[PDB]
Structure 1
Amino acid sequence: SQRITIDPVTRIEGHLRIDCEIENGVVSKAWASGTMWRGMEEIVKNRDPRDAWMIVQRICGVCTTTHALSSVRAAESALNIDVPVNAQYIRNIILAAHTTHDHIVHFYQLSALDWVDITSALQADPTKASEMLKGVSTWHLNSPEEFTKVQNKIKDLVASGQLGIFANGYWGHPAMKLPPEVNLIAVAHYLQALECQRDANRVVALLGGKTPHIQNLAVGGVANPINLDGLGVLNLERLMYIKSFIDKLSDFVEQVYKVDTAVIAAFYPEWLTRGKGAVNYLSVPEFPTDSKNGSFLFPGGYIENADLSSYRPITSHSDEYLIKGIQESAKHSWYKDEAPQAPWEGTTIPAYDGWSDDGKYSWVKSPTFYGKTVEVGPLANMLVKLAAGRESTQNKLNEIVAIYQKLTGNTLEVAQLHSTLGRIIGRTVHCCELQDILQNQYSALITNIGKGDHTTFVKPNIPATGEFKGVGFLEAPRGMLSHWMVIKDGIISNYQAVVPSTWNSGPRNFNDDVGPYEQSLVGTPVADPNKPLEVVRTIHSFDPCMACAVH
Structure 2
Amino acid sequence: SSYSGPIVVDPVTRIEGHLRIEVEVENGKVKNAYSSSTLFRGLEIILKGRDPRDAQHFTQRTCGVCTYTHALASTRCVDNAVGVHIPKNATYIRNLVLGAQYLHDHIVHFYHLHALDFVDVTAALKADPAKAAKVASSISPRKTTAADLKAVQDKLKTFVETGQLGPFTNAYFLGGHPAYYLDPETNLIATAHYLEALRLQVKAARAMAVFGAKNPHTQFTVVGGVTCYDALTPQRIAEFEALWKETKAFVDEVYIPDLLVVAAAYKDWTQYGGTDNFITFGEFPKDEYDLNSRFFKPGVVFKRDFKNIKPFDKMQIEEHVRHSWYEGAEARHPWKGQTQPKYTDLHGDDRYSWMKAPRYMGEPMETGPLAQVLIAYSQGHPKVKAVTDAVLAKLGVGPEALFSTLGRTAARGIETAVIAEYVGVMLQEYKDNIAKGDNVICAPWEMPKQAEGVGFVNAPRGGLSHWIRIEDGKIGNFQLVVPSTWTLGPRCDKNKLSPVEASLIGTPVADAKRPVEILRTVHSFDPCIACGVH
Q: Could you tell me the TM-score, scaled by structure 2's length?
A: 0.97
- Aligned equivalents of 1:73, 1:246: Cα separation in 2: 25
- Aligned equivalents of 1:387, 1:237: Cα separation in 2: 40
Could you give the per-residue CA deviations for residues 348-384 of structure 1, whole angstroms, max 9, x where no partner exists?
A: 1010011117611000110000111100000001100
- Aligned equivalents of 2:265, 2:461: Cα separation in 1: 25
C-alpha deviation, 1:44, in angstroms: 1.6
- Aligned equivalents of 1:358, 1:380: Cα separation in 2: 33
Q: Which residue of 2 aligns with 1:261?
A: 259
Q: Which residue of 1 aligns with 2:276?
A: 279
- Mapping 1:366-385, distance limit 5 Å: 366-385=357-376
Among residues 503, 517, 525, which one is paired with 1:542 in the alignment? 525
- Aligned equivalents of 2:460, 2:353: Cα separation in 1: 23
Could you give the per-residue CA deviations for residues 49-75 of structure 1, whole angstroms, max 9, x where no partner exists?
A: 111101100000000010000001111
Among residues 414, 437, 447, which one is paired with 1:462 in the alignment? 447
Q: Which stretch shifts more, 394-403 or 335-344? A: 394-403
C-alpha deviation, 1:482, in angstroms: 0.4
Q: Which residue of 2 aligns with 1:519?
A: 502
Tell me if structure 2 keeps the 8 A contact 1:83–1:293. Answer: no
Report the secondary structure of 2:365's partner residue. Answer: coil
The unaligned stretches of length 5 or more in structure 2 are: none
| Cα distance, 1:299–1:463 mapped onto 2, change above 3 Å | closer
- Aligned equivalents of 1:403, 1:212: Cα separation in 2: 36
C-alpha deviation, 1:398, in angstroms: 2.5
- Aligned equivalents of 1:322, 1:413: Cα separation in 2: 31
1:418 maps onto 2:403 in alignment: yes
- Aligned equivalents of 1:9, 1:137: Cα separation in 2: 33
Tell me if structure 2 keeps the 8 A contact 1:375–1:503. Answer: yes
1:445 maps onto 2:442 in alignment: no
- Aligned equivalents of 1:394, 1:135: Cα separation in 2: 25
C-alpha deviation, 1:185, in angstroms: 0.6
Letter in 1 for 2:135: M
- Aligned equivalents of 1:322, 1:72: Cα separation in 2: 21
- Aligned equivalents of 2:416, 2:127: Cα separation in 1: 30
Tell me if structure 2 keeps the 8 A contact 1:83–1:292. Answer: no
Tell me if structure 1 keeps the 8 A contact 2:296–2:372. Answer: no
Q: Which residue of 2 aligns with 1:431?
A: 416
- Aligned equivalents of 1:110, 1:528: Cα separation in 2: 21
Q: Which residue of 2 aligns with 1:198?
A: 202
Report the secondary structure of 1:122's partner residue. Answer: helix
C-alpha deviation, 1:215, in angstroms: 0.2
Q: Which residue of 2 aligns with 1:510?
A: 493
Q: Which residue of 1 aligns with 2:24?
A: 21
- Aligned equivalents of 2:204, 2:136: Cα separation in 1: 25
Q: Which residue of 1 aligns with 2:62?
A: 59
Report the secondary structure of 2:215's partner residue. Answer: coil
Q: Which residue of 2 aligns with 1:180?
A: 184
1:390 maps onto 2:381 in alignment: yes
Could you give the per-residue CA deviations for residues 163-204 of structure 1, whole angstroms, max 9, x where no partner exists?
A: 000111112111000001100010011111123222111110
Q: Which residue of 2 aligns with 1:37?
A: 40
C-alpha deviation, 1:400, in angstroms: 2.2
Q: Which residue of 2 aligns with 1:407?
A: none
C-alpha deviation, 1:339, in angstroms: 1.4
The unaligned stretches of length 5 or more in structure 1 are: 227-232, 314-320, 405-410
- Aligned equivalents of 2:414, 2:302: Cα separation in 1: 22
Could you give the per-residue CA deviations for residues 418-442 of structure 1, whole angstroms, max 9, x where no partner exists?
A: 1001101111011101112211111
- Aligned equivalents of 1:185, 1:101: Cα separation in 2: 20
1:355 maps onto 2:353 in alignment: no
C-alpha deviation, 1:337, in angstroms: 3.4
Tell me if structure 2 keeps the 8 A contact 1:472–1:484. Answer: yes
Among residues 473, 477, 500, which one is paired with 2:460 in the alignment? 477
1:11 maps onto 2:14 in alignment: yes
Q: Which stretch shifts more, 395-404 or 50-59? A: 395-404
Tell me if structure 1 keeps the 8 A contact 2:232–2:439. Answer: no
| Cα distance, 1:291–1:401 mapped onto 2, change above 3 Å | closer
Among residues 241, 244, 247, which one is paired with 1:243 in the alignment? 241
Letter in 1 for 2:329: E
- Aligned equivalents of 2:19, 2:276: Cα separation in 1: 24
Report the secondary structure of 2:284's partner residue. Answer: strand
1:139 maps onto 2:154 in alignment: no
Q: Which residue of 1 aligns with 2:285?
A: 288
Tell me if structure 2 keeps the 8 A contact 1:85–1:291. Answer: no
Letter in 2 for 1:154: L
C-alpha deviation, 1:291, in angstroms: 7.0
Letter in 2 for 1:386: Y
Q: Which stretch shifts more, 128-137 or 285-294? A: 285-294
C-alpha deviation, 1:484, in angstroms: 0.6
Among residues 499, 518, 522, which one is paired with 2:482 in the alignment? 499
- Aligned equivalents of 2:344, 2:41: Cα separation in 1: 17
- Aligned equivalents of 1:275, 1:17: Cα separation in 2: 18
- Aligned equivalents of 1:358, 1:422: Cα separation in 2: 36
C-alpha deviation, 1:511, in angstroms: 0.5
Report the secondary structure of 1:484's partner residue. Answer: strand
Q: Which residue of 2 aligns with 1:80?
A: 83
Q: Which residue of 2 aligns with 1:309?
A: 307
1:150 maps onto 2:152 in alignment: yes
Q: Which residue of 1 aligns with 2:97?
A: 94
Letter in 1 for 2:427: Y
Tell me if structure 2 keeps the 8 A contact 1:259–1:400. Answer: no
C-alpha deviation, 1:265, in angstroms: 1.0
Letter in 1 for 2:517: E
Q: Which stretch shifts more, 438-447 or 474-483? A: 438-447
| Cα distance, 1:519–1:426 mapped onto 2, change above 3 Å | same
Q: Which residue of 1 aligns with 2:221?
A: 217
Q: Which residue of 2 aligns with 1:103?
A: 106
Tell me if structure 2 keeps the 8 A contact 1:337–1:349. Answer: no
Letter in 2 for 1:365: K
Tell me if structure 1 keeps the 8 A contact 2:224–2:442. Answer: yes
Report the secondary structure of 2:443's partner residue. Answer: coil
C-alpha deviation, 1:234, in angstroms: 4.1
- Aligned equivalents of 1:234, 1:470: Cα separation in 2: 29
Letter in 2 for 1:198: V
C-alpha deviation, 1:280, in angstroms: 1.0
- Aligned equivalents of 1:67, 1:388: Cα separation in 2: 27
Tell me if structure 2 keeps the 8 A contact 1:136–1:403. Answer: no
Q: Which residue of 2 aligns with 1:335?
A: 326
C-alpha deviation, 1:222, in angstroms: 0.5
- Mapping 1:164-179, distance limit 5 Å: 164-171=166-173, 172-179=176-183
Letter in 1 for 2:296: F
Tell me if structure 2 keeps the 8 A contact 1:328–1:367. Answer: yes
- Aligned equivalents of 1:61, 1:396: Cα separation in 2: 30
Q: Report the identity percentage.
A: 45
C-alpha deviation, 1:134, in angstroms: 4.1
C-alpha deviation, 1:133, in angstroms: 3.4
